Amino acid sequence: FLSLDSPTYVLYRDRAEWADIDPVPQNDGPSPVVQIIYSEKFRDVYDYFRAVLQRDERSERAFKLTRDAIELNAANYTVWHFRRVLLRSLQKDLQEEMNYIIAIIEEQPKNYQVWHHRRVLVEWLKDPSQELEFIADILNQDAKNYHAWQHRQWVIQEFRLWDNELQYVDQLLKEDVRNNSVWNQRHFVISNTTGYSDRAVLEREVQYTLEMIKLVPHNESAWNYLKGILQDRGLSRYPNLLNQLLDLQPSHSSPYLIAFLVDIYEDMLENQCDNKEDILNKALELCEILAKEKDTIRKEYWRYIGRSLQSKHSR
Amino acid sequence: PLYSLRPEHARERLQDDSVETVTSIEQAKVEEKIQEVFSSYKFNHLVPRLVLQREKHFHYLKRGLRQLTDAYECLDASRPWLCYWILHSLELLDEPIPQIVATDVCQFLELCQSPDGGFGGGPGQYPHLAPTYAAVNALCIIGTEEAYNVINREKLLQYLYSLKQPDGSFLMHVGGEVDVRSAYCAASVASLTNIITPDLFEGTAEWIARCQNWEGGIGGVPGMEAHGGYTFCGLAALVILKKERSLNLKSLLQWVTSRQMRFEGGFQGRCNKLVDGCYSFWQAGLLPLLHRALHAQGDPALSMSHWMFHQQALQEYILMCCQCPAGGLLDKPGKSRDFYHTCYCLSGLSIAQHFGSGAMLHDVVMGVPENVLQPTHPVYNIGPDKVIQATTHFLQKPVPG
Numbered sequence: 001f002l003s004l005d006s007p008t009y010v011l012y013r014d015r016a017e018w019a020d021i022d023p024v025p026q027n028d029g030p031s032p033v034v035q036i037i038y039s040e041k042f043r044d045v046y047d048y049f050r051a052v053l054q055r056d057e058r059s060e061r062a063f064k065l066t067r068d069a070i071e072l073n074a075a076n077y078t079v080w081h082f083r084r085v086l087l088r089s090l091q092k093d094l095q096e097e098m099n100y101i102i103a104i105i106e107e108q109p110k111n112y113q114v115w116h117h118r119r120v121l122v123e124w125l126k127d128p129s130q131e132l133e134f135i136a137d138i139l140n141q142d143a144k145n146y147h148a149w150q151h152r153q154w155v156i157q158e159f160r161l162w163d164n165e166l167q168y169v170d171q172l173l174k175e176d177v178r179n180n181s182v183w184n185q186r187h188f189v190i191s192n193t194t195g196y197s198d199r200a201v202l203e204r205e206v207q208y209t210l211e212m213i214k215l216v217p218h219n220e221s222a223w224n225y226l227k228g229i230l231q232d233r234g235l236s237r238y239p240n241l242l243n244q245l246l247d248l249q250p251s252h253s254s255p256y257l258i259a260f261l262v263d264i265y266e267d268m269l270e271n272q273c274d275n276k277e278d279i280l281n282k283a284l285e286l287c288e289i290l291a292k293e294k295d296t297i298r299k300e301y302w303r304y305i306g307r308s309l310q311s312k313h314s315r
Numbered sequence: 316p317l318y319s320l321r322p323e324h325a326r327e328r329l330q331d332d333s334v335e336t337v338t339s340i341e342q343a344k345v346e347e348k349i350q351e352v353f354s355s356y357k358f359n360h361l362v363p364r365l366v367l368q369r370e371k372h373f374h375y376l377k378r379g380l381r382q383l384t385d386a387y388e389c390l391d392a393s394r395p396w397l398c399y400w401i402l403h404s405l406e407l408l409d410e411p412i413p414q415i416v417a418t419d420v421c422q423f424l425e426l427c428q429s430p431d432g433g434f435g436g437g438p439g440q441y442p443h444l445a446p447t448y449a450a451v452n453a454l455c456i457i458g459t460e461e462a463y464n465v466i467n468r469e470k471l472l473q474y475l476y477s478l479k480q481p482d483g484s485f486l487m488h489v490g491g492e493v494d495v496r497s498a499y500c501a502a503s504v505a506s507l508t509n510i511i512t513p514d515l516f517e518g519t520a521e522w523i524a525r526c527q528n529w530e531g532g533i534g535g536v537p538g539m540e541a542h543g544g545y546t547f548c549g550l551a552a553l554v555i556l557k558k559e560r561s562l563n564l565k566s567l568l569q570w571v572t573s574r575q576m577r578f579e580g581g582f583q584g585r586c587n588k589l590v591d592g593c594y595s596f597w598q599a600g601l602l603p604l605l606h607r608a609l610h611a612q613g614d615p616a617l618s619m620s621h622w623m624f625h626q627q628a629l630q631e632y633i634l635m636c637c638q639c640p641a642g643g644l645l646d647k648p649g650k651s652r653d654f655y656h657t658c659y660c661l662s663g664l665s666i667a668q669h670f671g672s673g674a675m676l677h678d679v680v681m682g683v684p685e686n687v688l689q690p691t692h693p694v695y696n697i698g699p700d701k702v703i704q705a706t707t708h709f710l711q712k713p714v715p716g
């Protein structure tokens with residue numbers, strides 16, 4: 001109704017409909033600390049929310065009062081809770097409220113409180129129909145919005161809407177193959193559908209990831225995904241991989257590439273491979289090439305690795 | 316010279332493989348801007364330039380601790396958080412807390428303690444693990460009997476119980492949701508006040524472990540992209556519950572190291588995401604923990620003087636790119652300053668400044684010797700002497716039942 005910026009906005013202390021209620025001022029003690037010098041409007045609204053909350057007043061007026069309160073500080077979880085308490089108590093039109101939250105989220109796409117409320121409204125309605133589309137719009141604003149990603153996942157699990165997300169992941173990856181949030185989504189879908197143990201699935205992915213690395217040789221996301229989907233499986237178990245990786249070495253190297261080989265060699269040593277010394281040296285070599293040259297930032301890391309390979313594969 | 320200034324450092328710049336994407340673009344931008352900052356110190360120096368503006372910082376904190384402007388209205392429900400951020404910030408700056416503010420802090424938090432246990436974003440607000448973690452943490456920094464006695468232990472345990480879930484998780488507040496951070500809040504609080512019962516953390520470790528993702532990091536809820544914040548909360552939580560082994564520590568370590576920006580020298584919170592001063596703690600805070608863990612598992616290949624990250628490189632970014640002239644610290648160059656970041660960047664620097672494992676101690680202080688901050692506990696992110704002081708005090712008392 002009356003926006004907090006309206007030229008004609010009126011204080012709750014001067015609203016007749018609220019006359020009967022004695023606002024409750026917040027108490028911070030005799031000598032406040034970390035005390036905010038609230039604006040007059042802010043203090044006013046909250047002086048009345050405190051009064052509404054105190055007597056647990058389940059009225060329509062209070063429901064509307066929460067709107068302003070939220071505008072004034074959408075982070076107020078307490079306000080967010082009581083509003084829902086009211087929506088229930090006043091049998092509120094949930095779709096109307098859905099329209100409310102839609103508008104609000106687009107406004108503060110980074111607020112946790114806002115998405116939580118959407119979530120509740122969604123399980124209440126048991127209707128996820130608007131979700132995927134809406135999240136897609138928010139993700140157009142910020143394709144890495146953690147909150148927007150968590151919600152999509154919940155929606156997809158709760159409502160088992162796995163059918164077209166993998167295509168969505170492809171869409172988003174073409175838009176930005178460096179979007180880690182999307183690579184995670186890809187893993188999420190697959191581990192939640194075919195599973196990665198389906199060898200036909202593991203092959204399609206490893207191949208996909210390899211083409212991706214080929215295009216953007218320095219994109220860490222791709223590399224991380226590859227390592228992820230094969231690490232527990234034992235990198236050294238895939239001889240063809242090692243051969244294709246070494247093939248990138250010329251026109252497609254990077255510290256990630258070298259890093260991956262290190263792991264491969266590391267796995268070989270664990271698996272008690274042949275030419276133990278030859279490999280150990282191939283590994284220690286790279287560790288130093290990284291430590292001192294290609295990945296100096298992680299020099300501390302690389303020295304420990306090398307130190308480890310030695311500690312259990314020498315003499 | 317300085318890592319960020321050496322000739323070869325121009326090589327650590329982003330190679331977008333000629334394939335521009337929203338990611339490569341924004342990253343390059345920050346790089347160019349930081350490079351600008353870098354050039355400034357390479358260019359001029361005749362007296363030491365890497366200096367922590369303690370003076371300015373102390374004013375910012377000393378003021379905030381008392382009053383805030385309405386810009387802070389957005390945090391009206393995060394007031395205990397401000398007591399913490401500030402008090403921790405001063406502590407690291409080795410600034411002592413005057414007995415009066417100490418008592419006033421106590422009294423404000425008292426007013427923020429729900430009758431039903433825990434603490435809310437302010438007086439008369441529903442309790443929430445977050446401000447709760449905060450308030451407790453802040454009370455222990457004051458470290459007084461007065462401070463400790465504010466916490467109604469009996470109620471604190473019941474509250475923890477109300478948020479406790481079957482699968483091992485905890486709600487952030489009643490009617491809220493869960494994520495790793497809440498688990499961390501509980502773990503933290505309970506251990507310090509000594510209120511851990513045989514079943515309070517039943518299944519919690521497994522839950523948290525289920526959050527560690529393919530990348531080796533930890534998201535908030537299982538499936539989610541791995542992220543510094545949650546990752547820290549996760550492992551620390553585990554460290555408290557003595558369950559770190561539940562996680563694939565190998566993948567976690569490799570991941571963390573991979574969060575430090577080669578060029579910038581600081582830490583990102585997610586892969587392919589920008590650098591941020593706060594992660595200086597979040598991300599770099601992991602290393603001392605993983606070290607503890609691996610060390611406990613007799614890992615022989617561990618360093619006896621350094622954390623597994625470019626300590627030198629982080630301090631430089633902090634000092635060179637995260638200090639505000641008016642006081643306080645921040646995100647990255649083009650951002651506004653705030654107590655939040657002021658707490659974390661400092662925490663992060665102290666982390667990178669002090670190493671300790673067994674009897675081995677070895678500092679690394681970039682810039683003037685005076686830049687040494689008070690060390691911080693990698694778990695609670697408060698003074699180690701403070702932790703020791705509090706647990707000792709609460710272990711005098713029996714766990715509620």
Ligand SMILES: CC(C)=CCC/C(C)=C/CC/C(C)=C/COP(=O)(O)OP(=O)(O)O
Nearest residue numbers: 110144145146496544545548584585588589
């Ligand atoms: C103890 C505790 C509560 C820890 C949590 C730490 C923390 C600040 C976590 C979440 C970060 C987040 C979702 C930031 C919003 O910016 P963004 O998501 O766009 O970008 P960013 O992930 O790089 O910050």
Ligand SMILES: [Zn+2]
Nearest residue numbers: 591593594646
């Ligand atoms: Zn930040």
